[PDB]
């Protein structure tokens, strides 16, 4: 049992016997990769063998199992370098990703490109195909250039393995040719372009990923297959019931769409329109506000949990940060935070504003072991909660609060007592939500 990172300098987390949840392993993973509390929910555990994701609440018990720490949730053109496509941003009282997440995504992107989890798009013509191969050489140049730039200093290990096997089938002269062309690209890029266009590492990673969005098939999207699909509203009933024949695609920007497996994708729903999701065995039922619903049969209960985890996560990212659509995949932290009236890693400004409107409890934007109370630090040590500086802990946040409310809190030349908590409200705006 081990959790793997696409970052090279980061060794994998090995786990001993005992129970874990995917969430806390993701917490540990985040801390290991210096991923901020803000970006944590963008990540999840992926089993490269079963090709399934873990729900935040999935219990893991220790055998030998290789799980992958992956950025799962994605919004095309988060980078904003695509002047044609849509613009993505976090609300402010602001980009989606921070440097940590960006680095990890870059590493993951390289991994996906090379190992072909991000398969290169199909060619429209021979010429287009060659152009694609050339772009791949470009990508290799970007990767290498970035590596050299980072440490202050062959293309084979930086291109999709498919293209590698393809190139290995051509005559030796052509391979020498490809080498020469690549060397020329690399040289010309590092000698002229880096300086001329003042290309930083950031720009580099951005162009790389931005290029992945157009170079590869369905980047950042998750496609699920089914042979039993039902869409029903007060206007229509479409019942598809034939090998699998139908596809349901999930993306952050467009939401839930579906089609016949080779047609243009049909829009079923964006996430804020969803009221709830029910799972029964392999059957997933998604319900919208206008009572329009989708039902589909997946291949297992696990795949159902995977799917609903994806949709629920996106809902949390786009609609309501402190809500869950399905008990089966309900993240422990979201539940416990709902129960304790505690906010996610919101900006302090939001907290202040919320106080102006009508104390506030919020997780820290800096580290995972702290709850900020509005500014005062509360420490969370291995299941136990306590006030920073003190030496008395409690089995839960509630008990701490109960004890805390009875105290006269003193700051420099000021004394007061905690009054009431302004807990989160439904679908309220904050930097935890992605505007699209």
């Amino acid at each position: 049992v081990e959790v793997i990172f696409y970052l090279s300098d980061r060794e994998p987390l090995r786990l001993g016997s005992g129970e874990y949840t995917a969430e806390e392993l993701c917490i540990r993973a985040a801390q290991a990769c210096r991923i901020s509390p803000l970006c944590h929910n963008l990540f999840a555990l992926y089993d490269e063998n079963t090709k399934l994701w873990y729900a935040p609440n999935r219990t893991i018990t220790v055998m030998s199992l290789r799980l992958h720490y992956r950025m799962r949730f994605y919004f095309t053109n988060w980078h904003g370098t695509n002047d044609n496509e849509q613009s993505v941003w976090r609300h402010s009282p602001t980009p989606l990703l921070d440097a940590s997440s960006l680095e990890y995504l870059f590493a993951q992107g390289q991994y996906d490109l090379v190992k072909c989890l991000a398969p290169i798009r199909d060619p429209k013509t021979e010429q287009d195909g060659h152009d694609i191969e050339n772009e791949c050489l470009g990508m290799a140049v970007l990767a290498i250039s970035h590596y050299a730039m980072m440490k202050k200093m062959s293309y084979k290990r930086y291109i999709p393995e498919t293209l590698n096997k393809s190139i290995r089938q051509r005559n030796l002269l052509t391979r020498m040719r490809i080498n020469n062309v690549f060397k020329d690209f690399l040289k010309e890029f590092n000698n002229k372009t880096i300086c001329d266009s003042s290309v930083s590492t950031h720009d580099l990673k951005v162009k790389y990923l931005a290029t992945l969005e157009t170079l590869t098939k369905h980047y950042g999207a998750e496609i699920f297959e089914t042979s039993m699909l039902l869409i029903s509203s007060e206007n229509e009933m479409n019942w598809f019931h034939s090998v699998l024949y139908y596809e349901v695609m999930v993306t952050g920007n467009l939401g839930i769409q579906w089609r016949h497996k080779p047609e243009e994708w049909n829009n079923f729903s964006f996430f804020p329109e969803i009221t709830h999701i029910v799972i029964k065995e392999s059957v997933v039922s998604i319900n919208k506000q206008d009572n329009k619903k989708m039902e589909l049969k997946l291949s297992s209960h696990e795949e159902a949990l995977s799917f609903v985890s994806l949709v629920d996560g996106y809902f949390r990212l786009t609609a309501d940060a402190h809500h869950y659509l399905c008990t089966d995949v309900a993240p422990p932290l979201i539940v416990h935070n709902i129960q304790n009236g505690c906010h996610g890693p919101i900006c302090t400004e939001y907290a202040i504003n919320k106080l102006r409107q009508e104390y506030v409890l919020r997780w820290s934007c800096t580290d995972f072991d702290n709850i900020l109370m509005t500014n005062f630090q509360i420490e969370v040590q291995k299941g136990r909660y306590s006030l920073h500086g003190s030496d008395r802990s409690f089995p839960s946040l509630g008990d701490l609060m109960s004890h805390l409310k009875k105290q006269i809190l003193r700051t420099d030349n000021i004394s007061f007592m905690l009054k009431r908590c302004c807990q989160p409200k439904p679908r309220e705006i904050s930097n935890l939500l992605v505007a699209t």
Partner: peptide, 29 residues
């Protein structure tokens, strides 16, 4: 033929390596 394939077209810089800049200019004498 050894060179009878697309890779022996004239080199063209991949657009992925094209980092555009405003490049405004002024003529000062």
């Amino acid at each position: 033929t050894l060179m009878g394939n697309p890779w022996f077209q004239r080199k063209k810089l991949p657009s992925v390596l094209l980092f555009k800049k405003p490049s405004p200019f002024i003529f000062i004498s």
